[PDB]
Enzyme design. Sequence first.
Site, short mmCIF file in Angstrom:
data_model
loop_
_atom_site.label_atom_id
_atom_site.label_comp_id
_atom_site.label_asym_id
_atom_site.label_seq_id
_atom_site.Cartn_x
_atom_site.Cartn_y
_atom_site.Cartn_z
CG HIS A 47 79.14 69.47 79.08
ND1 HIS A 47 78.29 68.69 79.83
CD2 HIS A 47 78.38 70.45 78.54
CE1 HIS A 47 77.07 69.18 79.77
NE2 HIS A 47 77.10 70.26 78.98
CE1 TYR A 63 81.24 68.65 69.57
CE2 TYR A 63 80.86 70.95 70.09
CZ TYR A 63 80.73 69.89 69.22
OH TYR A 63 80.10 70.06 68.03
CB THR A 64 83.45 66.31 77.80
OG1 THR A 64 82.16 66.44 78.40
CG2 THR A 64 84.48 66.07 78.89
CB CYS A 243 79.36 59.85 77.27
SG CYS A 243 78.88 61.33 76.36
C1 FAD Z 1 78.74 65.79 77.75
C2 FAD Z 1 78.97 65.66 76.27
C3 FAD Z 1 80.25 65.67 75.77
C4 FAD Z 1 80.51 65.56 74.40
N1 FAD Z 1 81.81 65.58 73.98
C5 FAD Z 1 82.03 65.48 72.70
C6 FAD Z 1 83.35 65.52 72.23
O1 FAD Z 1 84.31 65.65 72.98
N2 FAD Z 1 83.55 65.42 70.88
C7 FAD Z 1 82.52 65.29 70.01
O2 FAD Z 1 82.79 65.19 68.82
N3 FAD Z 1 81.25 65.23 70.42
C8 FAD Z 1 81.00 65.33 71.70
N4 FAD Z 1 79.70 65.30 72.15
C9 FAD Z 1 78.60 65.15 71.17
C10 FAD Z 1 78.43 66.37 70.27
O3 FAD Z 1 77.61 67.33 70.91
C11 FAD Z 1 77.82 65.96 68.93
O4 FAD Z 1 77.15 64.71 69.01
C12 FAD Z 1 78.72 65.99 67.69
O5 FAD Z 1 80.04 65.53 67.99
C13 FAD Z 1 78.79 67.35 67.04
O6 FAD Z 1 77.45 67.84 66.80
P1 FAD Z 1 77.01 68.24 65.31
O7 FAD Z 1 76.39 69.60 65.32
O8 FAD Z 1 78.15 67.97 64.40
O9 FAD Z 1 75.86 67.16 65.04
P2 FAD Z 1 74.43 67.32 64.33
O10 FAD Z 1 74.61 67.95 63.00
O11 FAD Z 1 73.49 67.96 65.29
O12 FAD Z 1 74.03 65.78 64.14
C14 FAD Z 1 72.76 65.47 63.53
C15 FAD Z 1 72.63 63.99 63.31
O13 FAD Z 1 73.27 63.63 62.06
C16 FAD Z 1 73.99 62.44 62.25
N5 FAD Z 1 75.01 62.36 61.21
C17 FAD Z 1 75.41 63.36 60.37
N6 FAD Z 1 76.35 62.96 59.53
C18 FAD Z 1 76.58 61.64 59.87
C19 FAD Z 1 77.47 60.67 59.36
N7 FAD Z 1 78.32 60.90 58.36
N8 FAD Z 1 77.45 59.44 59.93
C20 FAD Z 1 76.59 59.22 60.93
N9 FAD Z 1 75.71 60.05 61.49
C21 FAD Z 1 75.76 61.26 60.90
C22 FAD Z 1 74.52 62.55 63.67
O14 FAD Z 1 74.97 61.31 64.18
C23 FAD Z 1 73.27 63.08 64.38
O15 FAD Z 1 72.37 62.03 64.71
C24 FAD Z 1 79.42 65.42 73.51
C25 FAD Z 1 78.12 65.39 74.02
C26 FAD Z 1 77.88 65.52 75.38
C27 FAD Z 1 76.47 65.49 75.90
#
Ligand code: FAD
Length: 270
Positions: A47, A63-64, A243
């Site tokens: 990723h 992100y992958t 995942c």
């Molecule tokens: C190998 C790998 C590949 C990944 N690939 C992808 C990818 O392709 N695309 C992708 O989108 N993500 C992917 N993710 C996950 C990604 O890193 C995050 O989980 C997310 O998509 C973006 O992070 P963020 O900073 O927005 O979340 P953060 O702000 O860090 O999230 C904080 C918390 O708030 C929760 N949260 C906030 N608002 C809401 C809401 N409205 N409803 C429910 N829960 C909420 C989240 O679920 C989480 O628990 C991948 C993760 C891994 C490990």
Amino acid sequence: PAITLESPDIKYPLRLIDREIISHDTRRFRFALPSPQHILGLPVGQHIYLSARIDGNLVVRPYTPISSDDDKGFVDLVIKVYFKDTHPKFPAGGKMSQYLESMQIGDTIEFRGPSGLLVYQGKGKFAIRPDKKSNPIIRTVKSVGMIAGGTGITPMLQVIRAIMKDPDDHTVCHLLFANQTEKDILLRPELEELRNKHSARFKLWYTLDRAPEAWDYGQGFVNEEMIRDHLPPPEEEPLVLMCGPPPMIQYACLPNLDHVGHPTERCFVF
Ligand SMILES: Cc1cc2nc3c(=O)[nH]c(=O)nc-3n(C[C@H](O)[C@H](O)[C@H](O)COP(=O)(O)OP(=O)(O)OC[C@H]3O[C@@H](n4cnc5c(N)ncnc54)[C@H](O)[C@@H]3O)c2cc1C
């Protein structure tokens, strides 16, 4: 060709060139690699790391890509946007996701990679490192089990594509795609296209927390029966790849995997 991710320690700024509204929360974001002939440089299974200083705090989220190292000039990332004021516990929503939604055309976001413990080396051969420093343990498998939750299809899809693109790769992919609602079934056309084109190798089943009125597939959280019927028989010694949201893996996957007969060592979380 020309690798973009030449160094895993260097952050590479890429410009957003297109956005496709896959769903209300998830969007497909296309980014422009340094040259129209440049490639990403991402081994199947690994990723990238998006880095940006949002809210005064440098936020690095992984992100992958759904793009393949065969695709040139572009990087496609299906990223779900946790929106603000749409969750009772999280009124601030996602951090990187919301930055990405805000990103206009041509804005730059830094990329880092490759990063990951699993690399698919082809024809069943999965190099899974136990730790980032320890050497990869290589195991050839005839079937790959896969449990994807929402935006966790992008690591699966990478693998699925690679296998289906190689007609001599006879490894059989079983996918269990769990999403809240039908609208939340990301990359569903691609997936169904893959299954129709490579049915012998790609087995596809869905589960929806809240299914539609007509759901020929499955409903509810991930369960043992679906791991049993829609993933490879444990006797075939398959590799279960996972995942999904950390809770889903902890309470719905790992428990029900044991019940069916899948060992921890034959299972990997992206
Ligand atoms: C190998 C790998 C590949 C990944 N690939 C992808 C990818 O392709 N695309 C992708 O989108 N993500 C992917 N993710 C996950 C990604 O890193 C995050 O989980 C997310 O998509 C973006 O992070 P963020 O900073 O927005 O979340 P953060 O702000 O860090 O999230 C904080 C918390 O708030 C929760 N949260 C906030 N608002 C809401 C809401 N409205 N409803 C429910 N829960 C909420 C989240 O679920 C989480 O628990 C991948 C993760 C891994 C490990």
